[model samples]
Each structure stands twice: as C-alpha cells, then as structure tokens.
Target chain A: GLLAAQKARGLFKDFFPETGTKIELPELFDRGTASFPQTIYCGFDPTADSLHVGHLLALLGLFHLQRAGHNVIALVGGATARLGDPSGRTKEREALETERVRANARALRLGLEALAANHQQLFTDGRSWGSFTVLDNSAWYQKQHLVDFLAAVGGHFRMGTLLSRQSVQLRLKSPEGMSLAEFFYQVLQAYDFYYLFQRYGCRVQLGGSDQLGNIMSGYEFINKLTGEDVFGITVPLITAVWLNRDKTSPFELYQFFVRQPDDSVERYLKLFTFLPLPEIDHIMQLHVKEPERRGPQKRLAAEVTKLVHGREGLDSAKRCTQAL
Target chain B: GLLAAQKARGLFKDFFPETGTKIELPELFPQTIYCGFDPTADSLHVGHLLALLGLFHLQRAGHNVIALVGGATARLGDPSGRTKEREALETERVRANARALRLGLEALAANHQQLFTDGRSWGSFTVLDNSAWYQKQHLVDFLAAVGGHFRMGTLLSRQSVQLRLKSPEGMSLAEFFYQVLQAYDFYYLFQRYGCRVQLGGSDQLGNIMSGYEFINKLTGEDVFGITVPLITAVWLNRDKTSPFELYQFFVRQPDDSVERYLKLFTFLPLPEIDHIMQLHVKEPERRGPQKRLAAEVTKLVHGREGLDSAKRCTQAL
Candidate 1:
C-alpha cells in the first residue's frame, strides 16, 4: 500500500524536479537506519482555518516523529501566499495581500495549536533578510523611451523553461493569458527559499508532492548562494483509487496505511517511520513471511491511526474494521 | 542700445558667478550665458521667466550657443499634471500637479520663443544608462543597492555616495541643484573664438564703467547673478518725494539701456517732451539730458501725462 503511494511520489518528483538539477532516485543501499535523521517542514496556505484530512496525514507524521524524538516544523505560510505560490492550480487572479496573508498565518498556527496543545514550533512570519524592498523598475522599462523593461530584472528566461511549467501551460489552455506578474510567481517562491535559508539556517523543507520543483529550486539556490549543504523532501499525495473508497472515519485511514503494497510499505517505512533498524527489519521479515497476517500493515495502521484520531478513535476504528 | 545692455549682462555675470558651483570667482569677467530646461519641456516657470530679459543681454557678447535638457527627472516623477495613462491630481490635494506646472511653462515659452528661435543650435534628450539595472558592489545586507534612475556621472556625488562609508565633505557641483546649470549654457554661448582674441573683457569693463566707472578695474564690478548696492538721492520720506520730484528720478535713470524700457512700458505725451526738451535747452548741464531722455522715454511708456510730469520734474531738477 505504501509502495503505491511511494511510487506516486516518485512520479511526482520526476515530473517536477528543480529547474536545472537532475533527479536522482533515493539511495536505499547507503541508508543506515530505518529512521530519517532529517526533520520535515511543511507549509500550508492560510486560505482555510483548520486541517482537513489531507493535512492530517502530515500531522499524523508529526505525532509519530514526536514519539521518535524527531523534530517537525509546521510552517504556517505567512509570506508565501502573499506572493501567491503557484503550486496550487488556482492562478486566476493575483493572490492575497500581505496583511491578510499574515492573518491567515495566525489562523493556521491557531489550528495547529488546537491539534498539538503543548507543542508549537510555528515560525512562519520570520523575515530574516529584513524586508524585500521594491526598487522602481518602471524607469528600466523602455516604451516611453526607445525601449521597455530591459534586463530590469535580468534578461528573460527561455520560453521553453517557462512553458514547461504546468502552471503556465494550464493558463495558456484556458482563455486567460498569464500576466507577467503571475508568470514571475515561481521566481518569487525560489527567492523566498533563499531568503529563508539565509535567515534560518534551515536545511530541509517538506511540502506536498506538487511543490517538488519549487522546493528544489530553493534548495539549489540556497546551495549556490551559501555554497553549503541544504536539503528538501516532498510527501506523497494520498488519494482514493478507482476501486471506490469513503473517508468518514479513521478506520479507512488505518487500512490505507496498513495494507500499503510491499514497495510502497518499504519506501514509506523509510520516509514516515522512525522505528529502530532491527525492529523495522524484523517487521519487514514478518511482512514477507505472512502476507495475510498483515503484521507490518497492522502496526503501521495502529501507530499512525492512533496518533491521528487519538486512542479512542483508533479503538473505534479497530472495532469497526473487525466488524466489517 | 545693445552695448548698454551688454554692460548689464556683464554686471549680472560678475555678481552671481557661483550660482551653485564649488569654485571661487573674480569680480569682473566676460559675460557667460545660461539656458533653463523646464521639466515640462514645453514651457518655463514664472519664478524665473524674467531670465528671458537677461538672455537678450547675454546674446550681445561675441558668444552664442543654445541647448536644453530632456528633463529625465520629470518623466520619472511624471511631473506633468495630466498623463495619457495616469490619473489627474485631485483639487483637494495641497500640491499643484504637472497640469498647473505645464501652464506656467507654456506662458513663459509663449512670451520668449521669438528671442531664442534665431539660434540654430539646439540639443535633444540623451539617456545613457538606467542605474538601477546596474549590478554595483553589494554588501552582505544589500545596503549598497542604489537607485536605478540615477546617472553614474553626477550620481556618484549624490546621496548614494554620501551614504557609503568614509566620505567627508559634501561633494557636488552647486549647479546640480538648479537644473538650469546642467544645460551647459556657458559652453553653448562660447561658440566662436579666433586668432584675434579680445577676451570680451573690454566689453565687460565698458559695461561696468557705464555705472561706477570710478571704481578700480581690479576692484571688480559685479554683473548677472550678482549685485552691488549703490547710493542714490535720499528722500525725506514718501511725502517729501512729491510725485513731480519722484518723477524726476525716472528722468535721471542713468543706465540708458534699462531706462529705455520706460518708454516701452509707459504712455507719456508729446507736449511733455517739448517742455522737458526746453529744460534741456535752458541748461544742457543741469537738466537737458534729464528732460530730453525723460520725455522720450515717458511718451513711449505712459503717453501724455507720464511725459508731462517727467518734464516738470526735469525742469525742477
């Protein structure tokens, strides 16, 4: 089951690596422990007030990390949404304003706070590079003179690189043409990562799979800027298959993680789990020995489901799964 | 007449030498000319429109050139009151917009276009670089990022230079402040010179001598952008300075080129001229110059009554 999700993740990452960087497959052999020393930092737009099921998966991952003594930073996007990160398909108009965005950020932190009362590692409003001031680019534009904006912000990026983006192509397909401001959204996002890294010494960033390109762009830019090590990760996009699924309860969530296919399980165990090397190996062996016993799947489901839906909800889901 | 005006031109240049330059100056020198490029490009402002009068005098020098700036700064600020693509300034706003400013310039140009049109030489706008686009030295904090609108030439001497470290005295040509000095007026006016170099200083001191010729040449007489206080007949208050007696001073206005303006500005009649001329005949030494000049000037400036009083005052003097 996790194999399928991990495969979905691989495809997404392949589809959108950073602009110039090559996409390399994960190094399984060189890996030491089942636990990832790297922490995950996830950003959520402040459009909504609370976490939906889609976001709870990351929250569940965070709970697991807490038990494992690993760090998790839920970056309530205060500034990114101000420039309107193009990861979301809704590029109809320019995104929200800075003050409104800041309010949205507060709302996100409040929601996360409600979920984890004692633990709040929220740092979304950080402006480490001071503030990015807008220089008057109007003078550089040339139509009023003999020319319009010459390398005002540097020469134009090649059309192919710009068009290769789904965001650009998607707008082209529709009747609405993209404005220059909207087309430059990715540039701003890339700069944001550089700004963040310069400010926070942050090494790794985590987001939904759609953001692989943006995250990687930032990773490489920071590396180029600072000439040092920086990292990035994209979590899987959880989806119901064509085989009909309902998400009314945590029981399905349990089954989803538990019955993940072998490759998905192995990959996800590496990505989401922090169990000791011996324990994870023993589980993998048991998983191979008795496919129907569902040992690893059950453990995966129980740990995450309890973490997400709480012990009572986990128990309720378990009782329901047995009855079904 | 032009010679007398040339003298006044020399006077102007002698006095206001360092309009905003860093240099020190001498008292007497050849007359230099300057042109003002209004930001509107279409007109000059009222505050300095009288500069046209001075320009006429400046032309009497054996030099003449002409040019204007493209008003790069006005476009950046969009100083024109109404733009094809932008909104108009609201009436409630305290500041006047380019619309009002353009009107002022239009009035100036309308009044003086004829005097300047004779010149063949003129300049057009030139933009070498957009400084903001330049990749200058940036600090870790990006604090050194200067504005792109500035030109490197004078820009190096402006606030950007001052803001940088280890700078001392405020450095810049004073002419930079007035926008007029940037037009290269002296360069334009000094268009021709030859093997027979007269220095134009002869014309300069001749103009200076017409007034206070008693002063030493080395003492330096002032002109153009300069001033030197002079003594005139003192009156015992406005009441003692009767209209008739006061009018006598107009008859005695000695700078002939400037007094000639009185005829153009006033309306004094013919009878007044004959009467004042009689005074001149009675005593060429005491009043003839005053009477004849006053009637001639007043008749042209103020018609009959202007001349009548000017003559009566000439007789009394």
Candidate 2:
C-alpha cells in the first residue's frame, strides 16, 4: 500500500535487486508482516550549508516512508562531505575545510530537523507515525586509523570493481583526473551503508539515482561480510531553491514552486504535496476551464511552502505574494 | 673509497638514481644509510647477509647506519622477489619475529664493533623496529597524507606488482601495498635520520626505486638505493646453521670460489686478500687463504668464542 501510494505520487524513481533478494519491497512494508516497521535511511553529505531543492525528493521519500509507519533516518555525511562525492558531477567540488564542513553539517541538520518537525506538526492524518532520527557519520570515522582500515577493509574492495564505477571512470577520463580522496569516496559511502545495516538493522537505503553504484557496492560489501541482503531505492533528481529559511525565504520557496511550467504542475502536486489523487483530479478539472488562474501551480506552491516553512512562514509567503 | 671497496668485493650489486641527485654519492662521506630487514622469518639468514654487510661498510666509513627491522611492514608480505602471495601473517606473529630480528641485529653489530674496530671513529649503528613509529599511526591519516602522492599508474607498473598481477592466483591488496610501505619506510628514514641511502638485496631494486621516487616527489630532494648480491644457501641464525656448519660451508669452497668468497664475505683489504691468495697458490696444500676467509666471516657472525669452537671442532674431526 505504501509503495503504490508513493508510486502514484511519482516520488520513487526505482527500486533495485527486485528479484534475487529474499524479501521484496512490497512484502517488507506490508501490514501484518514481521518486517513491517523497517528502518530505512538516506545519507546527505554536507557539501553545502543548506538543503536545496535537489535534496527535496529523497527527504520526502523518507518522510513518506515515515508517515507509512516505517522507521527512517536522515543521515548527515559529516565525514564523507570532507571527502567530496563525485556522483553526477562533471567537475570537482570546491573542497570544504574541516571547520566549514562541520559547520555545514550542523546547519544542514538544523534544516532537516525543521522541515521534519514541520511535516509532522502541520500535516498528520491522525494515524501513528514511525520515528525520524538524524545520525551523522563522523562519529565512526574520526577514530579510524589509516593503515588499519586499509589492511582490513581495503582488501575487500577490488581495484577492478572499484575502478569500474561510472563515477570513477568519468573522473579518471577527465584531463584533471581524480584525486585519491575522490576515488575513496565510494568506499566510505559503502562502508556507511554497511555500518547502518549493522547498527540499526536498516535493511533499506534510499538515495538519488546517481547513488546506484555506491548502493550496489554497499550491497556487495554487506552481503560479503554477512550473508544477509539489503535493498536500495532511488528517487528522481530535482532541479534547487534552498530549504534553509535564511538562504531562501518562504516567499522565495513559495515562488519557486508557483513558477513551475503548466504541464509539470499536476505531477508536482502529486510529488510536492500530500493531496489525494481524486482531490488532485478535482483541482485539474477546474484548472483546464480557468486556465488563467494557475490553480494547480498555486496549490502546489502553497502545499510545498507549508510543509517546508510551516503555517506562520506560509502566512508570510502569502502576504508577500499579495503585496507584490 | 668505501663504495669502490664494496664494489670490488662483489658485495654491492648496483647504485640507483646513479645520476639524478643533488649530491653525488661517490663524492660524499659520513652520510646516513639504512637497510631494511623484514621479519618474514624470526632471524636473519645468509640471504640477508650482504645487505647487512653493506650497511656495516657504510658504518665503517663513518656513516651512521640503521639496520631497520620491518616490524610494521612484514604484516603486509612483500611480493618483491616472489611469484605468489604469502599467507597472511598475523600481527602478533610479526611482532614476535620483529623482536627476534632486532636482537639478532644488535648482537651481530656488537660483535663487529667489539672484535674488529680499525681504531677509526665509526659512525653509530642503531637497530630500530619500524613498528615503533607505525604502531600508533592512524590508518586514514597516513593514507590521506601519502596516498595522493602515489599515482596508481606508478604503483601498478612495479615489477613485483606486474609479476603478481599476471599470475593466475592474483595478489591481495596487502601484497600490492607492500612496496608502498617499503617506500614510506625509506621516506620516514630520510626525514628522521637524514638518511639518504637505502641498502637492500638485488630483488628489492624495484621497491627501492619506489622509495627514491616517493622521497623525490615529496621533498624534491634525492635519495639513493644500493643493492647487494644475494646469497641463499646458508642461514645466519646459529640454531639453523651452527657456527661449525657455517664455518665449514665457507671453509670448504673450491679454490676457484675461495678468492671471490674472500672478497664478498670477509672485510680483508684488497692488498691483504691478494697476498693471502698469492701465498696459498705457492703452497696449495696449506689452504691458508680459504681458512682465513672462513675464520674472518665466522668470527664476524658468531663472535670470537664461536669461531674458536668452530676451529676446535675442525681439527678434532
């Protein structure tokens, strides 16, 4: 039920290893099943100080799973951010200093917590929801020794398999090539997934499509070390306004969604809002007759703004729009 | 003078980066030199003798010499001279072997110092266990610090790596990383001891070159590699080759090899060695030069007492 509900909303892009694994995605979340309350997680690297529109889809997927009574953890990549992710990028990221990354991680956590709280407080259907926990990866990596980690874990990762990654190939093919730190990023991410699987029994990892190779690495690493399987799911990438209130105000965020093209509004409503399909259909019928009103786009903006910015912020956004 | 002496003795095999250093090795003196002995075994064998002897030559020339016990590195088995991967050696086993190696080296150096000083002030001979520095080193810190400086292409191109990679059994990450640790050991020695030269067996030329490159890259300062001809038949630890057995192994060499062994194994000067050979040629039945060569090496290895017992056994038999 939870899977189809999100599928209908177009929140989930794809699920992986669908057949070979012992438990299918549907069975893991089905009511009355022993694995009903699965712990699912997605990691966010502190590459920036604010959660932008790019992060919205994965957070919403986790929130959707949380609303469906599955335990969810939004991970802060405090250590991984220092190593910089090479996924979906043509050029290297600007290197962040330790102080800057720590600051970045802390501020990003604040944004996640704010939006999570806003989601729970502002839009509940009266059923009990699962817990939402925020965890940072730096707790484990800080004490890691270089030779010890290489002597133990490096053996598990084959140079052949690791070099075969699209992300690695792309960077290796570049004129600048890739740094050793960038090359090692996937190993750390894979280790992170295995860490979560061990500590939390988190069977599912949710990520963006760019993360499929890393997730597969985690799957292989976990399955190799322990004879158990974990699953990966991805959400489509989004195009970003900042989620931090100070970086992009509620008015700007509201304006960001309202500016979406007409053809994409119905899909945005299903994805960016919690409206039932029938009510969405009802709004669409009126939008076709009253084309000048921009009904679906307005509803999409108002719903997303309220979820991210809360009632008071949404009130500010509405007044700002009226004055303009 | 020391380099020429060691080369004429057939002791030192080759010197690398022969032309690419700030200072010319042949023209320098009172330098610091180090030779690494990995404790793959609990004691030094005849296989390790020439390199140790090479370091002794440097020390005799008033250059500080370090006989480094590869306590940290033996855990990752070196595939330098081999075609196969070694069975993983546990850290505790390596630690035990390392201690044994340090003690063996100290005993040999003490014997060399006390029994055969030329009255010239020799440089210091320090035996160090590499684990002393590596034991507390954090893993990520070292990799993040040095891994970037090591290019994958350069690492992949090592003869030892290529040898193992081409084999059907393949190689472990630990095995591939052996040269890296060895190179870092050289780099560490360079920084801490201002040691610019590494001495090793001929098989280690590739690994030594890696050290040369790494040090050159990291500091833009040059270092040197000196390799010794390998001798494999005998063991150095007394338990494996009793003093008498080791003495007889050298003593019984044919007349043809006697002159060369005298040059390779004993520290006798060229003029003295030539005179001993000339006198023996005049009286072939006396076996004077052969006996002298065996006695000099035996005393150097086992001390005067062990060498005395070795001759006493020979006369009795």
Candidate 3:
C-alpha cells in the first residue's frame, strides 16, 4: 500500500531489485511479527552548506515513511562530501577544502535538524510516529582506518563492476578523467549503507533518481555481505530553492513554489504536502474552476515553507507578502 | 664501469630509461642506490644472490647502497610472476622473516667488507626495513594522499596485474596493491636516502618501473631501476645448504658455465677472470676455475673461516 500510494503520488520514481530478493518490497512492510517500525534512511551530502528544495523530495519520502511508523534517519554525508559524488554529472566538482567541508557539514546538519524539528512539531496525523534521527557518516568514517576498510571492503568491489557503473564510465571517459578519490565515492557510500544497516537496522535508502547507481552499489554490498535485502527508493525531478532561511528566506521559498507551472502544482502538492488525496483533489478542483486564485500553488508554498521554515516563518512570509 | 662490468658478466640484464637521467650511469659515482628484498623467507638463499650482487657491485664502485627489506609489503604477497594468489602471511611471520633477512643481509655486507675488500674505501651499505615507515601509515591517509597520483589506467597496465586479472583465480586486492607499496618503497628511499637507482630481479622490472614512473612524476627527476639477469645455484639457505654445500655447489659448475659463474658470483677482476680461464684451459683436470670460484663465493658469503670448514668438509666428504 505504501509503495502503490507513493508510486501514485509520484513521490517515488523507482524501487529497485524488482525480482531477486527473498522478501519483496511490499512484503517487507507487511506488518508481520509486530515489525511495523522499520528504520529507513536517506542520505544528504553536505556538498553545499544549505539544504535546497530539491533535497526535500527525499526528505518527504522519509517523512511519509516516518508518519507510517517507520523510523527514518537523515544521514548527513559529511564523509562522502570529502570525495564528491560523480552522479549524473559531466564534470568533477572543484575539491572542497577540509575546513570548508567541515563548516558546511555543520551548517547542513543544523539545516536538516531545523527542517525535521519543524516537520515533527508542526505536522501531525494525531498518532505516535517513529523517531526521526539525523546522523553524519563522518561519525563512522572518521573512526575507520583506511587499510582496514580497504582490506575488508575493497575486495568485494570488483574492478569490472566498479568500472561498469555508468557514472564511473562517464567520468572515466571525460577529458579530465576520474581521480581515484572520485572513483572511491561509491565504495565509501556503499560502506555507509552497510554501516547503517548493521548499526541502526536501517533497511531502506531514499534519494533522487541520480542516486540510483550509488543506491545499487549499497544494495549489492549489503546483499553480498549480509545476504539480507535492503531497499532503495528514488524520487524524481525536484530542483533547488534553499530551505535555509538565511540563503532563501521563507518568503522566497514560498514564492518559489507559488510560481510553479500549473501542471507542476498538483504533483508538488501531492509530493510536498501531507494533505489527503481527497483534499488535494478538492483543492485542484478549485484551481480548475477558478484559475485566477492559484490555490494549489499557494497551499503548496505555505505547506512546504512551514515544514522547512516553521509556522512562524510561514506567518512572516505571508505577513511580509501582504505588507509588500 | 659498474654497468659495463656487470653487463659483461651477465649479472645486470637491462637498464631502464636508457638515456635522459641526470647523468649517464657510467659517469655517475658516489650516488646512492637501493635494491628491495621481499622478506618472503627468513634467510637469504641462492635465488637472492644476483640481486644482492647487483647492489654489491654498485657498493664496490664507490656508490652508496641500500638493501631495502620489504617488511611491510611481504604480508601482502607479491603477485609478480605468480599464477595463483599466494596464501596471505601473518603479520607476526612477516615481521620475523623480515627481522631474520635483515640480520642475514647485515652479516653478508660485513663479510663482504671483511673478506673481499682490498683496503679501498667502499661505499656505505645500509639495511633498512620498510616497516619503519609503513608501520604508522594509516590506510586512508596514505591512499587519499598518494592514491590520486596513481591512475588506475597506469596501475592496471602493470604486466603482473594483467596476468593475474586474466587468470582463473583472480588477484586479491592486496596482491594487486603490492606493486603500489613497492613503488612507494622506492620513492621513500629516493627521498630519505637520496637513492637514485634501484636494482631488482627481472621479474621485478614491472614493479621497479612503477617506482620509476612515480618518482619521475612527483619529483620531475628521472631515475632508473636495473633488472639483473637471473642466476641459478644448486644449493641455498645457509642452514639448509651448509657452507660446504654452497661451496661444493659452486665448485661443481660445469666447464662452460664456470667462466660466467666465476664472473657473476665473485668480484674477481675481469682480467684476472680471463687469466683464470686461460689458465683453466691449460689445466682442465685441476678443476681450476671451479675451485677458485667456489673459494671466492664461499668466503664472500660465509667468510674465510667457512672456507676452512669447506676444506675440512671436503676431506670428510
């Protein structure tokens, strides 16, 4: 039901390993053995200091699962950020300095905490939901020894498999070529998932579709290592508007969604807000009847800005808009 | 002179970067050179002779020499010229083997100075265990620091990797990394010891070339690694083949093989070896070249006292 509903809402674009697992995706959430609370995690690489509206799609996926009684971890990719992810890109990122990344990672952690705190305190279905935890991968990566990690994990990654990843293939063929550090991104990311799976029993990873390749690496690593199925869910086509108020003010974030194309509002309402489908349809019905109101766009803006910037922020955004 | 002398004797097989070094190999003197010995076993054996002799030749030629013991790398078995992956060695065993090898090398270097030198100033011979540097190396820091410089394309190009990758039993990551560590070993020697030349067996040509490229890339200074021609000895391992057995192994070289063996196994002057050969042809029954070659090598490896024991054992045998 969760998979079908998420699929219907266009919240999840892909759920991988359609065939090979011992337990299928739906079967995992079947509520057997009183195992209603499963831990799911979505990674947020602190490649930049602020969380964009784009990153919220995956967070929304996590929030939906959390509301459905699954514990969700917002994993800050402080370690992975050190070696930039080469997913869905034509060129490498100019390397971030150590202190710069560390500072950014801290800013990112605060950004995520603020959003999750708002989501928990402001949004409610009137039931006890699972805990929302935010963890940084650097916690484990910093403690890990390089030779030990390589000896344990490197052998499992065949050069052929690692080479075959389209992400790797693309970067390898680029004129600049891929550095060994960039090449090792997937391996470290895979270890991150495996670490979470073992330590927190996190069974699901949520990310943008570009992360599908990296997701599969983690899936294969966990499957090959633990012989248990781990799930990956990729959300599609969300772009940037900073959730950090200092970068994108709540009013700006509100306006960002308010200006979405008519076709995009219905999908954004379903994907971004916690509104029941009947209410979404009722709201859309109003949009069709009276196109001038931009009701769904307004609601989408207010709802997301509240989740990102809190209720007071939404008030500031509205009051400021009125004042302007 | 060292290059021609060793090349003429068939001890040194090939010199890399045949040109374009800071200066040509022939004219260079008082330079530091090193040869790595993987501590695969506890003692030096016959198979180790040519690599050591290659270093010894340079030491005699007024160049400082270093005998690098691959103590850190031996735990990850070397895959060069190997079809199947070797059983990984325990760290304890590697450390012990490396310790024994270092002691044996020191003994031989001292014996060479004591028995063979004719009152001339020989270059410094230093024995260094690579573990000294690698012991504190945390893997991530090392890889993150040095890993970017080594391209996978260049690393995969090593013949040892190509062979193992195609084999039925694919290479382990550790074995694949052996050359990397070896290359870094050479780089470390170049930096710390100011060593410019590396001497290794021909099997190690690929490994040596890695260092050659790495050093050249990082420092922009061209250095060369020499691959010595292979050598064969019937007996080995001082404890396994006692001093007399090693002496007899050399004393029993065939007529045609004696000249080459004499030149390679002993530091006898080239003209005097010619004189030994000329005199040998005149006295074929005396085992002339064989006995002199035997005496020279036994004393070189084991000292004059061992030579006496060899004569004592000769009567017993």
Cα error, candidate 3, residue B165 (Å): 2.2
RMSD (Å) of each candidate, 1 decimal: 22.3, 3.1, 3.0
Candidate 3 chain B: 10-residue stretch with minimal lDDT: B229-238
Candidate 1 A-chain TM-score: 0.53
Q: Where does candidate 2 stray beyond 4 Å? A: A1-9, A90-94, A263-271, A276-291, B18-24, B27-29, B232-234, B248-261, B273-293
Candidate No. with top TM-score? 3
Report how far off residue A169 is in candidate 2 (Å): 2.6
For model 1, state the Cα shift of residue B168 in Å: 41
What is the alpha-carbon interface RMSD for each candidate? 17.9, 2.6, 2.8
Give the per-residue lDDT of model 1 (tens digit) for B223-243: 233222111132212233443
Greater TM-score among 2 and 3 belongs to 3
Candidate 1: stretches off by over 4 Å: A1-41, A52-72, A82-84, A88-107, A111-182, A219-231, A235-252, A255-270, A277-281, A284-293, A322-324, B1-317
Candidate 3: tens digits of C-alpha lDDT, residues B134-165: 76676545655676677666777788577776
Residues A109-194 of candidate 2 have per-residue lDDT tens digits of 89899999999999999878999999998888877765666667656666666767887788777776775567777888888888
Give stretches of model 3 more than 4 Å off.
A33-36, A226-228, B18-29, B232-237, B252-256
> Of the pair 2 and 3, which is ahead by DockQ?
3
Which model, 1 or 2, shows the larger TM-score? 2
